[PDB]
Design a protein around this ligand. Sequence first.
Ligand code: ZN
Length: 252
Amino acid sequence: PQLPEVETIRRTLLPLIVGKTIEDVRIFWPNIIRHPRDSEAFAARMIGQTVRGLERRGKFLKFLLDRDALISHLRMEGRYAVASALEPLEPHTHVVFCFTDGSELRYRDVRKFGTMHVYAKEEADRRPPLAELGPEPLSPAFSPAVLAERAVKTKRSVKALLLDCTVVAGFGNIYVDESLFRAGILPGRPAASLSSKEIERLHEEMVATIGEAVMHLYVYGRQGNPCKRCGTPIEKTVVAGRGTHYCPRCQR
DNA sequence: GGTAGATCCAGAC
DNA sequence: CTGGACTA
Ligand SMILES: [Zn+2]
């Protein structure tokens, strides 16, 4: 799921778990557990705590308990569901939080790429994976000035810059390609080569693209198909080690 | 320090 | 071969 989907999850999941008390934590793929390193310590500390809130930072979910916060990233295919302890688990269920009311919060992930970290609430923001996380793309903290500052000081491509979680929080590949198309900028352009005009335009399109989503595609996954603005075939290459889609006419 | 490469997974290829 | 976010 991308940032807008994660926000939807935050909003919809909260009422399904708020006020419930953890009675057990069951782990079927311990590699998902990143802190404490020991999955047994992760499980033990959460028992007895009540879910008090659910926040999002970038594509991370932050479950707020009594003493601890659980920081969860779903990566490509992670998913949460709340269901009865009486029913069989769905395939690829790797972590289950069992509540005292006989319900469960289940984490599924066919790819097993997702991660979980638990720390005392007051430590969460200063430890991985939230430490160093850049500003929310929809916040005043993410501004053209901030983007400009990062762009001038690097030798990387503009696409590489936008994918950097320290630059802006949770801006995914799809939205990078879409934003760059809408801003008229080739993804392989060195970030430092962007004019102040291009930086402003790019920031504008970034906010608009992800903002719209939180509330069709021009290039992403459309390689070989005509551009919706000019009819030129969309092309796909590799930039910043990722599948990259662009129109060679609209983008410069 | 900056930046690329290293890496985990399993399904599609 | 592919994706997001320690090491050298
Ligand atoms: Zn075009």
